[PDB]
Amino acid sequence: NLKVVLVSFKQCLDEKEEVLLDPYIASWKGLVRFLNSLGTIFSFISKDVVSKLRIMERLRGGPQSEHYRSLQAMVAHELSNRLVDLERRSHHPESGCRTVLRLHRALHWLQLFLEGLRTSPEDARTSALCADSYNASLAAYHPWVVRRAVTVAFCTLPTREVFLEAMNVGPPEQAVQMLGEALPFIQRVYNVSQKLYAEHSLLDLP
């Protein structure tokens, strides 16, 4: 049931067009749930996305819980209270901003991945579809050892039909429909966030 997760990204944006951290984490746990269902190799990958969702939970359940209500609320609080390492890795290695930025880039990879599938020919290899989207979103931000490790996991990916079928919305061409109809929900929460981070020059936090 991937259709459920891709639309739980509607509740991320409220009326004021702010990204809320609580639906964000909730939808993300839903995406994590979906990755683990691709092999124990992928389960190994998502181990980090989870560790970061915890960092975000641990802040929303703390003294400054109100400040982590939204991303803008977060960026405002942390940037002004000098709680963010802007230059290089140092005193604030688990700040909300640097943490979310990582989730953000990863969310960019998944959206590009699924969108890659949707528009894919029937003969397309999933390993290749994922790699291309990986190279477009994360490759630039990952160490050598990570990149190669990731490259290996890609080869344990199901085939296009099996992967699409695994979305529990029916046959391949039927999920390809759901994709086009549920993808924009995550595509917007991304772009909003990309704006917010680009604004405050937070696009390369260490």
Curated annotation (Swiss-Prot):
An N-acylsphingoid base 1-phosphate binds at residues 48, 52, 98, 102, 142. It is a peripheral membrane protein. It is found in: Cytoplasm, Cytosol; Golgi apparatus, trans-Golgi network membrane; Cell membrane; Endosome membrane. Mediates the intracellular transfer of ceramide-1-phosphate (C1P) between organelle membranes and the cell membrane. Required for normal structure of the Golgi stacks. Can bind phosphoceramides with a variety of aliphatic chains, but has a preference for lipids with saturated C16:0 or monounsaturated C18:1 aliphatic chains, and is inefficient with phosphoceramides containing lignoceryl (C24:0). Plays a role in the regulation of the cellular levels of ceramide-1-phosphate, and thereby contributes to the regulation of phospholipase PLA2G4A activity and the release of arachidonic acid. InterPro entries: GLTP_sf, Glycolipid_transfer_prot_dom. Belongs to the GLTP family. Changing residue 52 to A: Nearly abolishes phosphoceramide transfer. Induces autophagy in a dominant negative manner. Changing residue 141 to A: Reduces phosphoceramide transfer. Ubiquitous. Detected in heart, brain, placenta, lung, liver, skeletal muscle, kidney, pancreas, spleen, thymus, prostate, testis, ovary, small intestine, colon and peripheral blood leukocytes. This is Ceramide-1-phosphate transfer protein. One of its GO terms (molecular function) is phospholipid binding. The keyword Nucleus applies. The lineage of its organism: Eukaryota, Metazoa, Chordata, Craniata, Vertebrata. It comes from Homo sapiens (Human). It holds the Pfam family GLTP. One of its GO terms (biological process) is ceramide 1-phosphate transport. GO terms for cellular component: cytosol; endosome membrane; Golgi apparatus; nuclear outer membrane; plasma membrane. It catalyses: N-(hexadecanoyl)-sphing-4-enine-1-phosphate(in) = N-(hexadecanoyl)-sphing-4-enine-1-phosphate(out); N-(9Z-octadecenoyl)-sphing-4-enine-1-phosphate(in) = N-(9Z-octadecenoyl)-sphing-4-enine-1-phosphate(out). Keywords: Cell membrane, Cytoplasm, Endosome, Golgi apparatus, Lipid transport, Lipid-binding, Membrane, Nucleus, Transport. It comes from the Eukaryota. Its main location: cytoplasm. The gene is CPTP. Changing residue 105 to E/L: Strongly reduces phosphoceramide transfer.
